[PDB]
Structure formats: C-alpha cells, structure tokens
Symmetry: D2
Subunit: 442 residues, 4 copies
Amino acid sequence: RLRSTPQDELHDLLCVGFGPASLAIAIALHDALDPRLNQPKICFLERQKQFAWHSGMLVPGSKAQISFIKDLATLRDPRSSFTFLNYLHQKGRLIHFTNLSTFLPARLEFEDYMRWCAQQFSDVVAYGEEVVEVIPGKSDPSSSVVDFFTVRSRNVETGEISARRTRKVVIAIGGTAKMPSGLPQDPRIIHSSKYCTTLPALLKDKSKPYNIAVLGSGQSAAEIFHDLQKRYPNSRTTLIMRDSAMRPSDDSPFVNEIFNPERVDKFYSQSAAERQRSLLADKATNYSVVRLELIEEIYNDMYLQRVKNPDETQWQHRILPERKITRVEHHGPQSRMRIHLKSSKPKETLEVDALMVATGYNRNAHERLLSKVQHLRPTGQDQWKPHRDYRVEMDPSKVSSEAGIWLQGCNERTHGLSDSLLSVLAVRGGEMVQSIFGEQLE
Amino acid sequence: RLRSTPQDELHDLLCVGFGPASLAIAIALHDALDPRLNQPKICFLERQKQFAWHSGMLVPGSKAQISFIKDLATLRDPRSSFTFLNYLHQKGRLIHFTNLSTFLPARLEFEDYMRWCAQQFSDVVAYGEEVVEVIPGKSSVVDFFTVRSRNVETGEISARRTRKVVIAIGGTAKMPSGLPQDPRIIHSSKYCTTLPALLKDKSKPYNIAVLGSGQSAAEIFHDLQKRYPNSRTTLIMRDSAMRPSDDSPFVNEIFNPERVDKFYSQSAAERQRSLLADKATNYSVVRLELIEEIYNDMYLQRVKNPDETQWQHRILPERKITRVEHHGPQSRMRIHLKSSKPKETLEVDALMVATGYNRNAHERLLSKVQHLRPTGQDQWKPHRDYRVEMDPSKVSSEAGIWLQGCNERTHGLSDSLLSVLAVRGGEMVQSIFGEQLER
Amino acid sequence: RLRSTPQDELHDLLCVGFGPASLAIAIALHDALDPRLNQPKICFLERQKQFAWHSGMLVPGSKAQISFIKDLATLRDPRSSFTFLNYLHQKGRLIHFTNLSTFLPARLEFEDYMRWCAQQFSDVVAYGEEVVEVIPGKSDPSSSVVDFFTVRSRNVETGEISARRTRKVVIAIGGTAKMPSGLPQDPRIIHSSKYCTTLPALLKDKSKPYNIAVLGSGQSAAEIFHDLQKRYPNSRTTLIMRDSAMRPSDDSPFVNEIFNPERVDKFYSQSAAERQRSLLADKATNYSVVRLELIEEIYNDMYLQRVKNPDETQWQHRILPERKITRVEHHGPQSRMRIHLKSSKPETLEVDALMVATGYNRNAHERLLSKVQHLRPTGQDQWKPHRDYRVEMDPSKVSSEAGIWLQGCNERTHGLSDSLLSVLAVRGGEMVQSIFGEQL
Amino acid sequence: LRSTPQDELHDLLCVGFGPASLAIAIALHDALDPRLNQPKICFLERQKQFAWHSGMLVPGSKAQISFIKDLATLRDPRSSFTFLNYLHQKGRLIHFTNLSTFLPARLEFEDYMRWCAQQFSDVVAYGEEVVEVIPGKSDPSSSVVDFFTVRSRNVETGEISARRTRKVVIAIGGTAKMPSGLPQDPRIIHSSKYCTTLPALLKDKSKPYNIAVLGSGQSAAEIFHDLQKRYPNSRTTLIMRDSAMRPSDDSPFVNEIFNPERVDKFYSQSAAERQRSLLADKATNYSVVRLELIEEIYNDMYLQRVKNPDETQWQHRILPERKITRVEHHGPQSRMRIHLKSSKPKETLEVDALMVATGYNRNAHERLLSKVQHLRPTGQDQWKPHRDYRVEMDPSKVSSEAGIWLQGCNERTHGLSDSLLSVLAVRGGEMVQSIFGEQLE
Ligand SMILES: Cc1cc2nc3c(=O)[nH]c(=O)nc-3n(C[C@H](O)[C@H](O)[C@H](O)COP(=O)(O)OP(=O)(O)OC[C@H]3O[C@@H](n4cnc5c(N)ncnc54)[C@H](O)[C@@H]3O)c2cc1C
Ligand SMILES: Cc1cc2nc3c(=O)[nH]c(=O)nc-3n(C[C@H](O)[C@H](O)[C@H](O)COP(=O)(O)OP(=O)(O)OC[C@H]3O[C@@H](n4cnc5c(N)ncnc54)[C@H](O)[C@@H]3O)c2cc1C
Ligand SMILES: Cc1cc2nc3c(=O)[nH]c(=O)nc-3n(C[C@H](O)[C@H](O)[C@H](O)COP(=O)(O)OP(=O)(O)OC[C@H]3O[C@@H](n4cnc5c(N)ncnc54)[C@H](O)[C@@H]3O)c2cc1C
Ligand SMILES: Cc1cc2nc3c(=O)[nH]c(=O)nc-3n(C[C@H](O)[C@H](O)[C@H](O)COP(=O)(O)OP(=O)(O)OC[C@H]3O[C@@H](n4cnc5c(N)ncnc54)[C@H](O)[C@@H]3O)c2cc1C
Ligand SMILES: NC(=O)c1ccc[n+]([C@@H]2O[C@H](COP(=O)([O-])OP(=O)(O)OC[C@H]3O[C@@H](n4cnc5c(N)ncnc54)[C@H](OP(=O)(O)O)[C@@H]3O)[C@@H](O)[C@H]2O)c1
Ligand SMILES: [Ca+2]
Ligand SMILES: [Ca+2]
C-alpha cells in the first residue's frame, strides 16, 4: 500500500536506518493512510541486507524486555493490523502464544514480528545501503538557504556511492558499540553486538577447551557469559566486572511509569538539571543491570560448581568482580591474548582465546553522519538539539522551513529513558507522521 | 450500527439472555457488518436490569480465570474494536494495565469491559425481561416461534415473533436436595447480593458455614474472613482437600477454539472419557494461589493456637450434610455432618451453598416446542453449528433453535466459558446470517 | 561410631539394601545411641559398589522433589548431626545454599548429602553384595520354630556367595524397572533407570542426528525428553504417550498433607477399600505427572519450533499423544528399530534408541523371601506388614524375637509417602524402637 | 543459665534484650552445653517481656530473612535454639514445611525468639530502662577504671538501681528518626508506634479518617497498605519526596554482603572503601520496598483507576515528590493541616493523623556512655569498635579486665548486616569468645 519513489526524484522524507524506530514510522504512515483507521514520497535506507533486530545478540533463550503490548502499534491503536497479536493471528499462532502465558516473547519471535511488519514496506526500503554523509542542497545555487538534503549511501556489497535527494531526513540509527579506550584492536576482541555473528567464525570448535572472557556486568554481559557455558561446554569462562556484583534491573510498576508514552511531554518540559537528576535516579531500570531471573540462573550454575569443588579458583566458569583491564598483549601468532587485571578500586593475568566486550553503546553517531550539515545549526551549538517533536534546531537564515532533520533513539537526555527503547515507538511513530506529514495529509 | 427492530415484526433472530455468549454474537454480527473488517432483524432479551457478569460473586480481589487475549473478539479478529485492549485504550487505561503485568484482569474490570461492549447494542437489547415460554408458530408446519417474556418490574407478558431462536441462559444454581427453604441458606451465586442484607453488622461474631470445595467455595470462605473479621467460618467439603486447578499448557489446549471441531467429531464414549479426564481444569478445583493463601491463613491460626478445634476459621474435610435443621428465624440453623466415606453439629447464622450449577434450564424453557424434536428424543441434540435437531416434517427450513453454553457434552469444556466466544460468535453469525449477508 | 559386627556372628538386625530407607534407620540408631540427643549387632548389604541415589537418572538440572526439611533426620530431631543443614555447615556451604532461596536441592546435591551420611556408617555396610535369598533358621534341633534367618548374598565382583545369620531382617530394596510386557529385549531399548549410565555407551556421538523415542508421560519421561534435546542437540526426539497430554503434579499444600509423617497412623487404620480409594484420589501428587515448571519449559521449546516452522510434522522434537506401541521391529544389522504406533483410544518411527520411562514395581521382596513365605499365616499370598512394618508371622512357627520388616514397598497399607523420602526420618525412629526398643 | 544477685560484680551486663543480646545468651548457652562443645551474666531490657518491633507487627508482615539466618543455625545447626527446632518443639515443623516459604510471618519469628528468650528468664530483668554507664574503681585511690556501674530505671516504679560489672554490651537497636521541622503532637506518630498508638487515637475502625503516611521505605509501604484494611473507609495519602517506591534488592550476588564471613572482608577495607561499599548496597534495605508489596499497592491503585480515571478523586492516593513545609496543629479542631511543596530543588491535606515512617537513628549508645567517654584514647570523639566489637579505651586509664562492646550500631565498620538478624548466630559466637574466652578455657 506504500509505493516506491524513484531513486532520483526529490523525496519528502528519507529515514536513515530501518530498525524498530523507523519501522514504527512506516507503520504509523501506513495507518494514517488507512481509511479503515482514519502518498508522501518516502524511503528508508538500512545498512544490513535484510531487517534484523540486534542479530549479534540473538542468543538462545533471550527474551524481549518489553511487554508485547508495547509493540509497534498497539499503544497508538490496538486495531492496527501491525499489532503483535494480529501478526500472531496472521501466522496462525495466536492461541498458541496465549497458552504460553508470557508478556515477554523470545527475541527471535519479536524479531520475526518486526520482520513481518517490515516485509510490507519492502518497496520503500533500500537494504545494504550505509548512509555515510548528508550534504546541503539548494534548488537555486545562488540561494542563501538550504532547501533539501542529498543523502549519500555506500553499497555494503560493492562500495558504490548512491545519492538521494530529500526535503526531510530522519536519523534512527540506534547505537554504536562503546569500547573501553584502552583495549587494542584485534580480531579476538569482540563487542557484544557481534557475539552471535562473529565469535562462531573465530572459535569454530564448539567442544574445544577455549578460555573466553566477558567484560561487563549488564544484560549483554550476563546473557553472553551464561550462553557461552552452553555454546562451548568445555570452555573456561571468566566474567570480569568493575562493580562488586551483577545487579538486578528495576521492573517495579511505579518506577517503570517513566516509560509510559504520555510521560514524554512532562520529562521534556523539565529543566536540563532536573532531567539530568531524573535520568540518574532511574538509570537502574535498564543500564548496568540484569533481569533478576537471569542473575539467579547464573548464581545457581555457580552454586553447582561449588557443590563439586569448594575452591572457587578451580571452577570452570568464574566471576572476577571489582577488576579492570589495564593491558592486553595480543601480538604474535599465538592463539591466546594475555589480559592484565587490576582492582577497580580508586596484578592478575588471564590467557584468553577471545574477549567479549559487553560494555554497551553510544548514541552519538548522528553527529558524524551530519557533519557536512552542522554549519546549519544555530551558533553556539556543538550538538544537534531536538525539539519536543524531535526536529533539530536549524538557523532559519540558513535552512528553508520546508526542509528539516529529525532524530530518533538518541534523545534520552531531552525525552527520557524510553527514547532508545521499544517502549514509546507506536505513539512516537504517530507523532512523527503528524509532525513530518500533517500538513501534506490534510 | 445495529438498529432496533420494532417489537411486533417477525425477527430473524432472537437471543434469550445477554451474557457473554449472546454478547459475542452481537459483536461478531457488528464486525461482519463493519467495512474495516471485511441489516438482520435481531433482538436480545435479558432478565437482569443491565449487563452483569455473575454480580453475586464479585468478591473483592476476584480475578477472571482467562487470559485477556480470550476476550470477546481478539481470537476471531485482533483488529476488532471490541477487543479488551481497545477497550482499555478507549478508557485511557491501556498503559496502566500494561504496567500491571497480568493476563488475568479483576472480574470487576472484565465485567466492565463486557459492559462497555454491551452498551453498544443497547438499541437491540431489552433488559429486565425474563423469557418464560417459546411457543410454536405457523398448514401443519411450524415456521416461526413466539418468545414470551415477563417484565421483572411490572410482570407484564410480552410476545416477540422470530424465525430463529438462540438460547444463551448460562446455568442455574445447583442445590443439594433435601435442604429446607430458609433465606439464610444462600447459593454462592447470590453471595454478594443476599448475605450482606442478611448479616448487616460486619463486626458481629456470626457463625457462617460454606459448603463445597471448588473456586466459588474457596473465594467465599476466604472473603468471609475479611468481610466479617470476628466471624467463625467453617468450610464443609466431602473431598479431603481443596485441589488445584490445572493451568498447565498442554492440558489447557482443550480450550483452544479449533479443538471444538476435534472434540465434536468424537464418539459419545470418547467425549465422556475426555471430559472426565480433564475435569480438573475447572470443576471442583481452586486456583493454586488461592489455596496457598487460605492455607497460610490457617497456618497463622495454628501459630496462635495449636488446637485446631478452637480456631476461629476451620475446614471440615471428608464430611457431608445429612440435614440442615431450623426452628425459625428466632434461632440459628443446625447443620448435621457425617463422614463422606462410603460426625459434627454446627450452629450457624447462614449457610453458603457453593455447589455449582446446572445447565439444563433450556429444556423447561423449550418444553412447549419439544414436540417438534424427532420422535424418541428426550433431550435437545445440537449439531456442530449449535442448531438443535428438529423433526423436518414439522419445522420449516427457515426456522430453527440454537443453544449456547449448555453443550459441554457435544462441544467440550470450553462451551460454558469465555474461552471460545469470539470464534464461536463468528461461527454463529455465519450459520445464522451467512446467506442473508451474502445477498 | 557404629561399630562393625564380625560377619560370622548372629546379628541383631540385617538390612537388605543401603538406600535412603535403610540409611535413615542407620541414622536413627546412631541418634538413639547418642546421649547428647537421647550397641546392637547391625549390618547392611548393598548391591551397588557405593551409595548412589538413582544415579541412572542424575540428569543435568534435575532437582529433588521434597523440601530439604524432609531430609533423613530433621523431622525426627532438628538437632541431629545428619540434617541437610548440618551437612551443608560441615561442607562450608550453608550460607551459600541459603542464598539460593530454594527448598529443592539439585538431585546431585541431595545425593551427595546422603552419601556424606552414608560414609559415616562404612563400618557396618558391605557394598557390592546382592542379597539373593532369606532362608529360615531353627537353632533348636528339637523345636520346629524358626528363631533366626540366614541372608545369602552374591558378591557382585566375584560372584561368591556369603551367608550372614540374623534374628531380624529389614528389606529396603526400593523398586524394579517396570517394562511394558509387549516390548522385546534389545540394547537399544533402555529403561529410564539406566538413562545416564547406559544410553551414552550406546549412542556415543553427541552430535549425530539420532532418532530417539521416549515412552511415557510422567516425571522420568519429561526429564529424559527435555534432557535428550540438550545432550544430542541434532537428534530428532519423539515423546510417545498414551495420554492426551503431560499433566502437572499436585504440590498444593492441603493435598500434600497426605505426605505428613503423622498421617501414616490414620492411613493405616483405614479399610482396604478406603485405602485403595484414597491412593487413587491422590495418585496425581506424584504418579504419571510432571512438575509444572518442567512442563512449561518443554512447552516453550515446542512453541519455539512453531515460530520457526508452523508445520509440526516437520519439527526436530515432537510429542505424539494418545499413542501406544503395538510392535517394534528390531532384528537385523540395521542401526534403527521400527516402532509401530496405534491410537490408545479403546504410523511408524525409525529410531536408534527407545527410552522407556514406564515407572517401577515394588514387588521384589516377594522373590527374596520365597523360602520363608511358608511362615506367613494361612491364606495370605502377600506379606502383610503391621503398622510398625513388621510382617505377620504365624506365631506357632516363628519365635517372638525373630522377624522381618519391609521398607518402601508398603504404599497400599501405609500411604503414598511410603516409597519416598517424605517420612524416612520419623520412620527410622519408629523402626529403631520396633526393632531395638526392648534391647535399648 | 542461673541468676546472679543484683548487687554482685558481674562478668557481663548486656543493655537490651532484643535479637542481638538474645543471640549472645544463646551462644553462651551453647558454649556451655557439652553436646555442642557459670559466668555471672545479666541482661537489662526496657520492655516488660521480649518483643520484636511490636509497634510494626501489622497483619501479614513477613520477616525479611530466610529462617536459616535464625539466632543459631549459621553457627551450629545442631543447636536447640534453631528455628526448625523451635517448630519441632511447638509440634509445627511439618506444617511450616508445607508452607514452602523461607520468610515466616513477623508474628511467628517474634514467637520463635520469645521462645528462645524464655529460657533465659533467670538472667533477664525486664522493665528496666538503662540510663547511664558510670566508671568504677575497685581501689578508689588508684588511677585505673576496672569495672562499670550500670544504672537502670524500673519502668513500673521509676526507682533507680545499680548493677556493677566488668564488661558491658550495648545492644539497644535504634531510635525513631523524625524530620526536625515536624512539631510534637499526639496525631503525629512514628511508624514504630503504629500498632500500639494509632488505634488508641483513632478508635472507630469505620470512621472516614484522613490519614497521611510520610516516607517511602518498607515501613511507610506496610502502614499505607495496612491502613486501607484497618480503616476501610479512611482516605489515606502516602507522601514521599522520591518520585516512586523502589524495590529492595534481593538478588543473590549482591545479598552476599549479608554473609557472616563477609564481616572480616568489610571491616578490613579502608574507611573510604567502606563508605563507598555501603552507599553502593543501600538498595538492599534502605528506602526500598519488597517488590511484592509494591505490586500489591500498585494493583490496589489500579482498581481505583478502573472505578474512576481521575486520581484526585481516589480514596487512597500517593503524592510523590512532595515535602512537608508546615504543619498547623493548634486549636480544638480534630484535623491538622499539612502544607506540601515540591521536593524538587501550594497544596494542603487535612488529616486526623500523620504516620511518620522516616526510619531510625543508631546513636543512643553515645548518650548512655557519656559518663565514660573520657576513657577513650586522646583525640577520639566517637567510640571506635574493633573487629570483635570492643570499643577502644585508653589503656593507661582502663584495666584490661574491663571493657565495653557495641552491637547493632556498627554499620560503618562492620557492614549493612550489623543491625539486622543476618549475622546474629555467628556474631553471638564471636562475642562469647571475646568476652568469656579465657574464663571458659
Ligand atoms: C542486544 C541489545 C542491546 C541493546 N542496547 C541498548 C542501549 O545501549 N541503550 C538502550 O536504551 N537501548 C538498547 N536496547 C534496546 C533497543 O534499543 C531497542 O530494542 C531497539 O533496537 C531500538 O530501535 P532503533 O530502531 O532506535 O535502533 P536499532 O534497533 O538499532 O536500529 C537502528 C538501525 O539503523 C541501522 N543503521 C545504523 N547506522 C546506519 C547507517 N549509517 N546507514 C544506514 N543504516 C544504519 C542499523 O543497521 C539498524 O538496523 C538494546 C536491545 C538489545 C536487544
Ligand atoms: C462466579 C462464576 C461462576 C461460574 N460457574 C460456572 C459453572 O458452574 N460452569 C461453567 O462451565 N462455567 C461457569 N463460569 C464461567 C461462566 O460460565 C462464564 O464466565 C460466562 O458467564 C458464560 O457466559 P454465558 O453468556 O454462556 O452465561 P451467563 O454469563 O450466565 O449469561 C447468561 C444470561 O442469561 C440470562 N438469563 C438466564 N435465564 C433467562 C431467561 N429465562 N430470560 C432472559 N434472560 C435469562 C442471565 O441473566 C444471564 O445474563 C462461572 C464464572 C463465574 C465468574
Ligand atoms: C529418578 C527417580 C525415580 C523414582 N521412581 C519412583 C517410583 O517409580 N515409584 C515410587 O513410589 N518412588 C520413586 N522414586 C522416589 C524414591 O523411591 C525415593 O527417592 C528413595 O530413593 C527411596 O529410598 P529406598 O531406600 O526405599 O529405595 P532406593 O533409593 O531405591 O534404595 C534401594 C536400595 O537397595 C538396593 N538393592 C536393591 N536390591 C538389592 C538386593 N537384592 N540386595 C542388596 N541391595 C539391593 C539398591 O541398590 C538401592 O541402593 C524415584 C526417585 C527418583 C529420584
Ligand atoms: C519494623 C522494623 C523496623 C526496622 N528498622 C530498622 C532500621 O531503621 N535500620 C536498621 O538497620 N534495622 C532495622 N530493622 C531490622 C532490625 O534491626 C532487626 O530485625 C533486629 O531488631 C535487631 O535486633 P537488635 O536487638 O540489634 O535491636 P532491637 O530488636 O531493637 O533490640 C534492642 C532492645 O534494646 C531495648 N532497649 C533500648 N534501649 C534500652 C535501654 N536504655 N535500657 C534497656 N533496654 C533498652 C529495646 O527495648 C529492645 O528490646 C527493622 C526491623 C523491623 C521489623
Ligand atoms: N473468579 C472466577 O472466575 C470464578 C469464581 C467461581 C467459579 N468459577 C468457575 O465456575 C465454575 C464452577 O465453579 P464452582 O466452585 O461454582 O462449582 P463447582 O466447580 O461445580 O464445585 C462445586 C462444589 O460443590 C460440591 N458439591 C456439589 N454438590 C454437593 C452436594 N450435594 N453435597 C456436598 N457438596 C457438593 C462439589 O463437591 P465434589 O468436589 O465432591 O464434587 C464441589 O466441591 C468453575 O469452573 C470455576 O473455575 C470462576
Ligand atoms: Ca513489572
Ligand atoms: Ca507447596
């Protein structure tokens, strides 16, 4: 029902990335066009070759960390055909999911749900295209204002650069792997985001006695550490964390009301200081914390080792708390790197075949992608500043009001902790369609 | 969308009862007429003064016993505007329910959801109307029916004519035989409505007994201890213990909508064997969490006094009532108990009788048309699409009677529940209005 | 502490079997002898080479099915040195177990607890001894009265027969594998009791796409079916059950009071008709049922196959309900047997192994005592235990100071707890008073 | 354990007979028991019998410790003072087993400890409120203090009596912490006196009282939840300066800080490391609520929303991010007027009672020891307990046979478990060794 736009025509909207955030916009646009519920020239560019939701971390048994009611449509309109329940119905799996009695689908299943949603937009999604730059465009070269943008993308397979012109741009590119600055670059040092996809290529013998270290103590680290013990049953795994313990995520109901869609207005209207203080107070809802059930499972596995041998130093799988990595030796043809550990308080060494670095993500890559348009920001800004409707501030003497750039998923500091999650995507997709296409549709 | 039909015209369909079962049919009819998703002369008669879902058993804290996904539309079409989630959304309560993390809404909430659904059919529902007779209408062929109802407020008898009749009247209170008639002997279905009128002083040390060991008995026994803090309650059961309901996932696939075809297609012997094999999913069983809470309350009494006979609240297992003696409202009733194997006397202010329900009241209601059944039948026989067998030499092809909610023997344990209402509603609309709608 | 008796001497008590039931008797006799809580010529004969608790079913992740308070001593005396909590304390593990917040230890752990208890009685337990018969003894050439028994056992390693004389015998030999009669004998057909110990030797390549069927739908079937899926991650497993579904065990509190030690008195005093009707009413506590958590786990694995493929005939792991095996072709050099399946209401599989999880019988004491069954009173075809677990003997034939007790095979007279760990602590205490009371 | 005449020189006098002092009595009994392995000992307790926070024994409240952490098991599971042995003596062991819970009702755990305490009745004097600890010199002309005189007030008569002892244990728990700007008024009641004092004030269970609760930790949540059941027609208001009730951390790795053997590890860290560690782990106990109770309160709120979507009209409300700026409480009117402002760096409530669930202080031992604090080493203004809980004394002023020990107020040096039931069994054994080790050997 959403038709393609010729690559070389002037688009109304180009979205960089086709993860859940952009997909929720495609769904909301489809729904806003659906006569049952209530065409712009739109495309989406995605570097991956097909839709995939953190495929590097699709570990067996991993569960979504959101109730399925927070899918890409229900909180905006439960009648939408893009709800998780309607997806199940179309797959003939609705009653079977009902008998599961869980709000938390397997990540594999929620990925498939979103894949099923995305498949209905394949005519307007360009996969295998990595946006590399956004550059100013002027319909009249001697005009003093930019009135469109040219987005250049690199073909992930051939490296060819393609160009699309558009009035409006959405940046919804998720996060980039955050790595500790003192770790060297090495094929054996692998960020959590590439665990399932690259670690098997590196360590091909599942039964070989590898020594595998995991750095971190949030959800990525816990899932990898737990999974490694099953994926390489004879390995020796070491969880290295600078905290004293894995800590539980806060799933409690009053605290989690910060994720309600209608809280975005209130959070945004707060002073930067109150926003800073609020984000700090609620950081334990998602960051550096592990779902209690997974902590308890790991704790149980540790206990079973203790039953077999009371000396923890002799355990197959170990946790080294309050440690930090001070040096990595990684040169020469040998298989193992040497990891140097010191206390994380204000030496030990491990020989490892691979280091999984589960140290989280940054959400600042939009600043790099937009560097060739950052001269259009108002003087005195060194970061893009989104308004309540996610449109970034532009110097009006330099940019036409009909052109604009919106950010999605990197606005935690202005819009709250729900900004990078699935939590408010259904509602926000509806807001973005109104903001970007409201006049056009009316 | 569904418009009234004048009281005197020949209706296409008249449904007796407007509980969840008839409501699901109205919803599916609405949805089949809704252009987003893809008029017959229909009305409903309901004895209660408004839609109400077992209002006598709306005890504080009671939860519906079905995942909300099994609401009145979602399993048929999750896009329907009559889903529970859409209901929550229209109330501005969707996110708040989400933060609850339960599939099992409070019964008060699920009633309100269904009441919200029912309010959309107010033009075609006549409340406060108790159907009393279904009369043959006419050659020697019966081709319509007259449904007579008594107004609960005025007692006036009204007649409505219809080609087709749906009987969806739920169940009637099953009482142990031989009980005297006494207003203080109260079936569980009237607990919230009759006991507070009878026992008005919440702080008085009443003696209150409860008969039974299913979900109704447990809920009443647990609730009495909070409603009458100073009461002495006694749970009388002929089994040895409250037993947990089976919510295990493979067993509970018997409630799937698509199992109705498979169950129906079995022999009567296999259907009987199946119903007995799965009886622990719902009958004479208690949700484990409630069993454990009652058990904890009992243990705490043991902490205060090791002598169980001196407890405020007691359970008398493996007992049956041999008689309830009364000497007038001047004094307490005397309950005589003996072992239920193939003794005690209790003096009580009230007896709550939580002994379940029968689902055969339709045979009385249809007695004046039972001569239209095929010779040699003493019970109405519903087919897979719920239409009862009629002697075709006596009844026209344009007329018929359907039963809903009383067909466990032919359609499985889900028949009397909410479990398959969304899907069954769609089937009923097809079977009843399919041709009409295709034209 | 418990000192050995010279093997050729006349013992006060010989217990056949050193599983938890005999062990609980050893522990209770130790405690009765400790002046700090409050010696007979006692010995135990055990077939296995060391103490082991259903080692053939020590499946990874398996948990005990009793609260640890129901251990071998606590319910009789929480001060006993043989409580699970003291065992943990002696191991330096008490605080660490406490942080688990569970009442159900891993079976591997509970076995090690009982093994730790057992090792304290090594002086009176002879391992590797399979008792083969109990023969009557008449110490008076004039009197025709049996006043002792000679228990003969076959040494598992040497096959040599040895004889021990005792006034009193306890038979505590647990259960024998119950196999469907129509099933042929074949090395690829293994009872669940030999799963961990026999199946790996038969199916040695953990990564081969084997076809493995499991017969049954109780706790053993579910544990094996779920375990096979991790052990042989490429196998195609099939759960064959004659019921329509796996059904949850009843762990609800009022029902499980049937397992209370003080209930044995009330159960025993009932008519055989009521005791039969009671056992059938409460069979769901533990027979032909699966702990709910494990049912849901299996169901979730099944659901995940449905996500990837809607057609269940094509799943890697399948459940076939309401089926019975009518025939198993197993002759031939072919690696796989052919299981023929019909409906169980009143298709063929090609498999490399059939795990048979069809439960146990507790009738083996009948063969062991055949050479003394003539000492029973006239008109009994079964041994009839009294409340104190002593079997009835014709008093004109057996001296009062001689007797035979049965342990763990008395469900019919003593309740569903009889074969479990449930009342072992208290029953041990009663057995020591029944057997050694007068002597103490 | 047999009585020592009040006027004799004791070996040990314990101030308080709560769980901490009882753990020492139990460990002394066990050390004296030949099955497991007399000093002149005396306990002084203000209450008339053993009682474990009886002011907060609200219906349904649970102990927040696995029963394995009782007063003896972690030191010796064979002790007759274990929780399981108590159940066995009550004829209740199997029944508790069928509960499948590690967390007894507070009522039950209190009864267990009362059952333990009754076996020490000969050495506990109830109804005695200790008021001061005074230096003693068996030779008044000498310059060294070699005993202490403990003075207590009889609660019934008010008479002071004196007991002399070589060694003193202070194990007095905590005192109610009140916000300083709140006035003193019979309608303003600390959570510790909820069950004992609020019913006396509000006698009519059916009256539609307006009752506010200040705070958002476990006491505030338990009271807020209880009031809705005790006064079914009341309007209750939970006033908190946080934005939400937050869950307590019961995850297993974090909760290893409560292990007995971790006391050595915590104590052996630098003061800065101890401060940082205590702050990191505050969510295990302080200003947090057991998740299950939070979920129950949230569900009760949800039901109100079903009946009426406008939260201002709800019977029971939560006012987050608020602070009390003024209380009007003079005049004959029954209700006080509470003034609220944002807690961020006008609105009024009229209430019949304000329950103040703002926690406890643990400095009351400093008052009791004021008349001996000149015996500390020069340059100390706070008591410094060593690893074995004995406070530092100037050795040139105090004899080695005299000493003062503290229990339950030593979080800063010994960890979060110090004020709880967590390490009492093991610590009792350590305290018996330190105080009576030579004497018993
Ligand atoms: C393993 C895991 C880790 C998580 N970590 C975090 C986190 O640190 N913080 C947090 O609040 N949420 C995190 N979440 C929750 C997560 O953010 C949401 O589930 C969801 O992925 C957000 O959708 P999004 O579309 O904004 O981002 P994504 O799901 O990341 O989608 C972004 C898309 O943009 C594409 N893309 C990126 N760059 C380019 C480019 N230059 N050109 C073209 N396409 C591009 C990517 O391929 C990707 O498909 C995590 C979830 C998982 C499963
Ligand atoms: C407290 C409680 C007890 C339950 N007990 C049972 C049970 O024993 N067995 C079981 O399988 N299910 C039982 N259920 C599940 C229950 O049947 C379903 O939740 C649901 O009510 C079935 O809907 P229904 O419309 O088929 O019947 P009902 O909900 O009972 O609705 C039937 C309607 O018909 C009306 N009516 C009856 N007679 C007449 C008449 N002569 N004229 C006009 N109107 C009439 C009634 O007023 C009622 O509104 C129970 C549920 C609850 C909450
Ligand atoms: C995997 C598993 C399966 C179970 N299946 C059942 C069941 O089907 N039914 C049921 O009611 N309970 C069953 N249980 C519960 C079980 O019976 C108790 O946990 C407990 O093992 C009973 O102790 P017992 O000593 O009476 O028997 P066991 O633990 O069986 O001990 C019997 C001992 O006697 C030995 N022995 C046997 N014959 C001889 C002989 N001729 N000579 C010398 N020694 C001999 C055996 O080697 C064994 O060591 C099962 C438990 C588990 C863990
Ligand atoms: C409702 C509740 C609130 C709690 N609040 C806290 C808290 O804010 N912070 C925290 O870390 N722990 C708290 N806890 C945990 C608690 O400290 C332990 O459960 C346990 O009470 C500690 O025992 P204790 O004997 O050290 O103190 P207590 O149980 O308080 O015992 C101290 C005893 O000393 C007596 N006493 C006090 N002064 C004198 C005197 N001058 N003379 C004679 N006797 C005296 C008291 O009567 C009391 O019996 C709380 C527990 C509950 C149930
Ligand atoms: N919150 C809810 O949604 C809710 C609430 C209540 C009920 N329900 C459901 O409605 C259905 C009916 O449940 P129910 O508890 O009302 O009834 P029920 O399941 O039919 O149980 C009836 C109880 O009464 C006993 N009984 C029947 N006749 C008796 C007699 N003459 N003498 C003594 N005892 C007698 C029965 O004993 P026996 O056990 O010996 O047969 C049984 O214990 C159930 O499926 C239930 O789950 C749901
Ligand atoms: Ca939650
Ligand atoms: Ca239980």
